[PDB]
Amino acid sequence: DPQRREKIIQATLEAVKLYGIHAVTHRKIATLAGVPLGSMTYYFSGIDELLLEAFSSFTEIMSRQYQAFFSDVSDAPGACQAITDMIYSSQVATPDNMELMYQLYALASRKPLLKTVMQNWMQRSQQTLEQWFEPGTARALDAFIEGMTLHFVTDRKPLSREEILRMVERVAG
Amino acid sequence: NDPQRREKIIQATLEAVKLYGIHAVTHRKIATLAGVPLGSMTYYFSGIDELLLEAFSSFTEIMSRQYQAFFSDVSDAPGACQAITDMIYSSQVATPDNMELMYQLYALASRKPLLKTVMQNWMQRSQQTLEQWFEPGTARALDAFIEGMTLHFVTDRKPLSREEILRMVERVAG
């Protein structure tokens, strides 16, 4: 059943945030999903397979909200404003989605299938930006977004939206 | 106080964090990884939180020495841009072990004020390093770019060429 699988997937993601990768178990995910422990075994082969599916699902939802910023963009100047919106909004409120995303970078370096998921996510992001930028610039821009977003977590001095826009437009070239 | 031994315990704490994650690290496991008697743990560190703090702190110092070393030969902005490129292209910053330790630190920083304090200090060091050649705003942009590019470099199915990276670094540098 599609809906219970998805609840298990979401429970898995929330579980990673609360407990960390090593500490996650079937019992914790089942309690978090409100499902019988016996059903964790049905929908997935192992805890590892589950985590992989759940990280995959997570990147798909990152991409959907990524494009969301760009649904109204029709050219490169508009894209620089959107990218600026995205970075600025991260600054003013740290999205709850990034320590999960840094975990994934580390994990990808030891887990090839996760690396495959991550490359797939990156290509999605590139493809979005490539609507308005040549491929190299698109790669630069997406790197700058992720870098700035992380930077905000532990940065004390504030950056204004305009300062961010000026940086984004320098990268866009 | 025995400096050498404390430092082996610090290092062992970092090895343990990689192996078991932060919520599994114990004095006994550090003790065996460090090759020191268990009583050395009590003599050097109050609790596990203190030890983790000092270990992650030491970790950021190692990263900082490394970061600095890329600019050893640098005396002007284009040389710094070449240095930043090397730093990205070398895949020496974002190794599997460093990325995993950086995850752990980012996470704990969200949950424990003191580790956030350790991270901000680390970031200030990187910024000061770059402000030798660049304006404070540009320094900040470059450091953010380095963070994103290094992660993309080791992950990308086909990463950017070195000259492409240089070209982009030079854009950010303005």
Side-chain angles (χ1 to χ4, degrees):
Chain A
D1 182 83
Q3 269 58 71
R4 290 127 74 161
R5 185 178 176 283
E6 181 42 54
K7 291 173 98 169
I8 295 178
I9 294 288
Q10 289 319 309
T12 299
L13 293 177
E14 294 176 25
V16 172
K17 302 180 191 260
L18 311 188
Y19 309 101
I21 272 301
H22 294 82
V24 143
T25 66
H26 288 309
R27 205 157 321 228
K28 285 183 164 64
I29 294 180
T31 296
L32 229 56
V35 299
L37 176 63
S39 80
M40 296 294 300
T41 46
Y42 183 22
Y43 292 108
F44 306 95
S45 60
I47 183 68
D48 272 22
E49 164 82 346
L50 176 51
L51 280 179
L52 196 42
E53 303 241 20
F55 293 147
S56 180
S57 174
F58 170 69
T59 64
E60 299 285 350
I61 205 193
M62 289 283 89
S63 287
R64 292 163 183 149
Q65 101 180 0
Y66 187 84
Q67 305 162 25
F69 270 100
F70 296 99
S71 48
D72 278 18
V73 173
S74 59
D75 53 20
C80 292
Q81 290 284 10
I83 292 181
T84 292
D85 287 342
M86 178 181 304
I87 292 173
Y88 180 64
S89 69
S90 111
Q91 165 174 225
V92 305
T94 51
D96 313 337
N97 329 98
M98 334 168 24
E99 66 182 69
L100 176 46
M101 196 206 286
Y102 210 113
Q103 174 71 98
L104 290 207
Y105 280 118
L107 249 188
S109 82
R110 339 164 201 154
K111 290 285 193 202
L113 264 39
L114 193 42
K115 191 138 175 192
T116 299
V117 168
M118 291 292 282
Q119 289 173 345
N120 192 275
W121 170 67
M122 299 175 69
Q123 149 64 18
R124 278 197 305 265
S125 303
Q126 270 148 219
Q127 170 170 105
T128 296
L129 297 188
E130 278 179 352
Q131 293 174 98
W132 310 289
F133 307 99
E134 65 98 11
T137 305
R139 284 178 161 85
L141 287 170
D142 191 56
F144 185 66
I145 293 168
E146 268 156 52
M148 288 283 282
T149 299
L150 299 148
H151 223 63
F152 286 142
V153 177
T154 49
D155 221 323
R156 270 198 297 223
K157 168 150 194 206
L159 266 192
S160 67
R161 195 192 182 276
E162 55 260 49
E163 281 157 342
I164 292 162
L165 175 59
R166 271 196 293 259
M167 297 173 186
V168 167
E169 280 180 331
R170 222 160 39 221
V171 178
Chain B
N1 289 334
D2 172 20
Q4 185 147 11
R5 172 169 317 187
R6 181 191 198 83
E7 184 62 22
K8 335 221 202 184
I9 295 167
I10 290 298
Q11 277 294 337
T13 304
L14 291 180
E15 304 297 329
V17 167
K18 299 182 212 167
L19 289 184
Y20 311 100
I22 289 183
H23 305 139
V25 154
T26 74
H27 280 197
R28 272 167 53 214
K29 274 160 182 342
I30 315 300
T32 312
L33 248 177
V36 309
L38 179 48
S40 290
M41 301 300 151
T42 314
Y43 171 98
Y44 278 127
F45 311 105
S46 36
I48 195 70
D49 282 314
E50 159 81 348
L51 172 49
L52 285 179
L53 278 177
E54 267 184 29
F56 280 110
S57 189
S58 173
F59 168 73
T60 72
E61 290 295 347
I62 295 159
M63 298 298 279
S64 276
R65 283 177 210 108
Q66 169 182 52
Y67 190 98
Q68 188 64 50
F70 280 107
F71 302 87
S72 170
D73 275 29
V74 177
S75 49
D76 56 23
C81 292
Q82 288 281 3
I84 289 170
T85 300
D86 294 320
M87 183 187 294
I88 295 163
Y89 192 79
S90 72
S91 310
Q92 263 154 33
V93 177
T95 62
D97 283 352
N98 289 353
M99 282 195 293
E100 164 64 11
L101 290 178
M102 274 198 265
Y103 161 65
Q104 300 282 9
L105 182 53
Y106 266 114
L108 247 199
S110 295
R111 320 187 246 166
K112 308 198 88 68
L114 285 174
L115 257 196
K116 169 109 157 195
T117 293
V118 168
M119 289 201 74
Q120 289 168 344
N121 272 35
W122 182 18
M123 272 200 40
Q124 161 70 6
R125 299 200 298 269
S126 297
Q127 167 87 4
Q128 259 322 290
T129 290
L130 292 178
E131 291 186 1
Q132 300 174 82
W133 308 285
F134 308 106
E135 294 294 314
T138 306
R140 184 154 164 176
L142 285 166
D143 201 34
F145 192 56
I146 294 169
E147 297 188 78
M149 282 279 294
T150 56
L151 288 173
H152 283 203
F153 188 77
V154 302
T155 311
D156 249 333
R157 179 61 194 204
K158 140 215 155 196
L160 294 164
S161 80
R162 192 192 174 275
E163 173 156 69
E164 259 169 320
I165 290 162
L166 172 63
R167 200 160 68 91
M168 295 304 177
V169 168
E170 289 182 342
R171 272 175 191 188
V172 179

